[PDB]
Structure 1
Amino acid sequence: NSIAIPTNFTISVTTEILPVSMTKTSVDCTMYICGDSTECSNLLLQYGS
C-alpha cells in the first residue's frame, strides 16, 4: 500500500541519427576489365552478358 508520485518534471531533448542514402556509384565493365585494349574487347565480348 505504498505508491510513489512524481512532483516535478524535466523536459529533455535527445538526438537520433539515421542513414538515408549512400553514394550512387557506377562502373563501366569493359573499361575496367580490360580498358583501351581493342585486342581484349573481342575476347570479352564472347564471355557472356
Structure 2
Amino acid sequence: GAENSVAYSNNSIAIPTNFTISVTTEILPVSMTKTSVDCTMYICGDSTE
C-alpha cells in the first residue's frame, strides 16, 4: 500500500466537514444449474448385458 504516516497527538482531532455518497458493488452467487444423472443411460447404452 501507500506508505503514509498519521499525525498523532494527545490534543489533536480531525473532524470531517464534507462527505461523498459512494456505491459499492458486491457479487454473490446463490444458485447453479440443476443437472440429473442416471446410470442406465450414462453407464450403459442400448445393451441389456
Same structural fold, with TM-score higher than 0.5 when normalized by the shorter chain: yes
Q: Name the TM-score, length of structure 2 as normaliser.
A: 0.72
TM superposition score normalised by structure 1: 0.72
How many residues end up aligned between the 2 structures? 39
Higher relative contact order (CA 8 A, sep 6+): 1
RMSD: 0.8
Q: Which has the higher helix share?
A: 1
- Can you give the 5+ residue segments of structure 1 that lack an aligned partner in the other structure? 40-49
Any stretches of 5+ residues in structure 2 without a counterpart?
1-10
Superposed structure 1 runs of 4+ greater than 6 Å apart? none
Greater share of strand residues, 1 or 2?
2
